[PDB]
């Protein structure tokens, strides 16, 4: 068959939303506290994540149907998915060659080791990089990548969600677009869809592990004082 | 006459405390979010103030008698004086020639204008620079400068103070040392002391004005999100 106008318009909105919230040159990274190789990398990565959350929020407000949700559900969705949306969008900077996120010269190239200096362990980093590698290999089209982020963000299976019925529906309409798109516009993408949903499950586990490690980092004021207000608000338990 | 051993030991402790909490090269400033010429300078100045508070705290813990106070009174004293201790120690970087705080190349030289881009008005900056100029002209000895900071920090006239009797006494012993020192070690310093106390009063007004302007900056989340946890904690009203 072939996509519908509404389906195609949703794709247009998401692709443009992402273009408007993701710089492939990473020129803003110089405004971040410099990276440094106890948790010497925490200041830079905190600023990177904080900047990124702001971007995820901008992209979110442009997901069709999201802004109609109550402010409470928007926040519930952002708070629980932010970390996953970030791991997803970061894949654009990940490189299978050097197994790192390359965003600049020697300074903005992030290795597993560097994240270790932000207070995280292999318990998290191993699966993360493993996830980044698997996702990169799916050679997603920008359209499928942007849909995967909108779909992940509209997971009604998040703590604190209220109108989990309307959220459920919205995620479904997006899932429909992604499925149609793959079938119609992506040759050899017969299994793709199923693989992409599997990626959402890996994100849940990564999310869980990150939350544990973040909690510890969070309870130590000497470390929490290195984070930013926004990061503290989005990853905090005060709901 | 001549200073006593105890009096001289207090001077030794304060001078060394200050040396251990104030770098005249300002090499740490590169770890701060870069300055930028809506409130483009706020990120850098927030980091500068946050870094400075940490330093004021280090110096404070070394003021003789301060650490014996209850944690509650230590916090009460820090929270209400921090801003003043900062304006005082900043005089070391202020220059009458260019009417600015010079801490680095073109980047770390702060003019009234730059502070304007941090959300502050002439209502504050005018008296500040005026204060910096007057204080610089007193050509204080490092010993008198360090005493003036310890004395300002131990002002029992601060909201939230409890044991205002012991604090009162401590400030008095320091005032005694400063007075003796000026008389004994500072030629032509007959009026000095009186002038230094007058400076403490100017600081109260500067403190008040800064508090007003900070409150406004503080209530706007788009701006408060640019501050740091420590700055938010020390200048916040949650006591």
């Amino acid at each position: 068959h072939m996509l519908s106008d509404e389906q195609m318009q949703i794709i247009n909105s998401l692709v443009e939303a992402h273009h408007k919230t993701y710089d492939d040159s990473y020129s803003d990274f110089v405004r971040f506290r410099p990276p440094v190789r106890r948790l010497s990398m925490l200041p830079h990565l905190a600023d990177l994540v904080s900047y990124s959350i702001q971007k995820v929020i901008g992209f979110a407000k442009m997901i069709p149907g999201f802004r109609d949700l109550t402010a409470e559900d928007q926040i519930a969705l952002l708070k629980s998915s932010a970390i996953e949306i970030i791991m997803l969008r970061s894949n654009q900077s990940f490189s299978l060659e050097d197994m790192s996120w390359s965003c600049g010269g020697p300074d903005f190239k992030y290795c597993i080791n560097d994240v270790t200096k932000a207070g995280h362990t292999l318990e998290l980093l191993e699966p993360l990089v493993k996830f980044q590698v698997g996702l990169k290999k799916l050679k997603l089209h920008e359209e499928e990548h942007v849909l995967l982020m909108a779909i992940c963000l509209l997971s009604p299976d998040r703590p604190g969600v209220q109108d989990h019925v309307r959220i459920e529906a919205l995620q479904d309409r997006l899932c429909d677009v992604l499925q149609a798109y793959i079938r119609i516009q992506h040759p050899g993408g017969r299994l793709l869809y199923a693989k992409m949903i599997q990626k959402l499950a890996d994100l849940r586990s990564l999310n869980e592990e990150h939350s544990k490690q973040y909690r510890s980092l969070s309870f130590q004021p000497e470390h929490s004082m290195q984070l930013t207000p926004l990061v503290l608000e989005v990853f905090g338990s005060e709901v | 006459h001549m200073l006593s051993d105890e009096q001289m030991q207090i001077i030794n402790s304060l001078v060394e405390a200050h040396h251990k909490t104030y770098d005249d090269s300002y090499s740490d400033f590169v770890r701060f979010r870069p300055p930028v010429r809506r409130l483009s300078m706020l990120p850098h100045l927030a980091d500068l103030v946050s870094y400075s508070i940490q330093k004021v705290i280090g110096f404070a813990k070394m003021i003789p008698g301060f650490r014996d106070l209850t944690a509650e009174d230590q916090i009460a004293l820090l929270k209400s004086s921090a801003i003043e201790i900062i304006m005082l120690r900043s005089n070391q970087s202020f220059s009458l020639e260019d009417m600015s705080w010079s801490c680095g190349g073109p980047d770390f030289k702060y003019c009234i204008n730059d502070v304007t881009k941090a959300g502050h008005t002439l209502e504050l900056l005018e008296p500040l620079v005026k204060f910096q100029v007057g204080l610089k002209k007193l050509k204080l000895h490092e010993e008198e400068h360090v005493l003036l900071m310890a004395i300002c920090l131990l002002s029992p006239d601060r909201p939230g103070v409890q044991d205002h009797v012991r604090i009162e006494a401590l400030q008095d012993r320091l005032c005694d040392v400063l007075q003796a020192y000026i008389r004994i070690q500072h030629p032509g310093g007959r009026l000095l002391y009186a002038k230094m106390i007058q400076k403490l009063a100017d600081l109260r007004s500067l403190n008040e004005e800064h508090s007003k302007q900070y409150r406004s900056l503080s209530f706007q989340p788009e701006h408060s999100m640019q501050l740091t946890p420590l700055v938010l904690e020390v200048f916040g009203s949650e006591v």
Binding site: Q54, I57, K61, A71, Q74, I75, L78, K79, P229, L230, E233, V234, E238, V239 | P221, E222, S224, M225
Partner: peptide, 10 residues
């Protein structure tokens, strides 16, 4: 309260 998230979500 989520002061920041609220403001950013416009």
């Amino acid at each position: 309260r989520h002061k920041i998230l609220h403001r950013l979500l416009q």
